[PDB]
Design a protein around this ligand. Structure first.
Ligand SMILES: *[C@@H]1O[C@H](CO)[C@@H](O[C@@H]2O[C@H](CO)[C@@H](O)[C@H](O[C@@H]3O[C@H](CO[C@H]4O[C@H](CO)[C@@H](O)[C@H](O)[C@@H]4O)[C@@H](O)[C@H](O[C@H]4O[C@H](CO)[C@@H](O)[C@H](O)[C@@H]4O)[C@@H]3O)[C@H]2NC(C)=O)[C@H](O)[C@H]1NC(C)=O
Ligand SMILES: [Ca+2]
Lengths: 70, 5
């Protein structure tokens, strides 16, 4: 799962807990305010709103098979 | 695997 909380560490709640295996890396698209993550099990890059809504998946990346950080 | 080395 990928969890969100207040910067205080309270209000901890999952926001992405479906179709996930090894979500190694996280990133924020500061321009669009969108959370990006990446899987090492399914080998996919995904991005969504900060609430975990509007989930999208990027196209296949040729030789990416164990992405750690992004 | 996925462990840190
Ligand atoms: C996986 O991740 C999902 C989220 O993507 C989690 O589901 C959410 O669990 C949360 C628990 O903290 C809840 O916020 C939320 O469930 C409810 O949300 C309701 C919001 O009200 C609107 O939406 C409902 C949708 O069914 C609709 O029926 C209603 O008319 C409104 O339009 C709340 O009302 C509801 O409150 C109930 O539960 C709380 C306890 O949690 C009680 O205190 C209340 O009295 C009441 O009985 C509740 O908050 C969940 N959202 C979704 C998408 O279902 C999963 O929990 C995660 N699971 C795992 C395995 O990690
Ligand atoms: Ca793999």
């Amino acid at each position: 799962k990928i969890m969100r909380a207040w910067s205080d560490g309270s209000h901890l709640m999952p926001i992405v807990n479906t179709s996930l295996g090894w979500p190694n890396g996280l990133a924020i698209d500061w321009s669009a305010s969108r959370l990006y993550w990446v899987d090492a099990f399914f080998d996919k890059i995904e991005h969504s709103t900060l609430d975990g809504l509007d989930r999208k998946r990027l196209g296949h990346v040729d030789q990416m098979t164990h992405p750690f950080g992004l | 695997x996925n462990x840190x080395x």
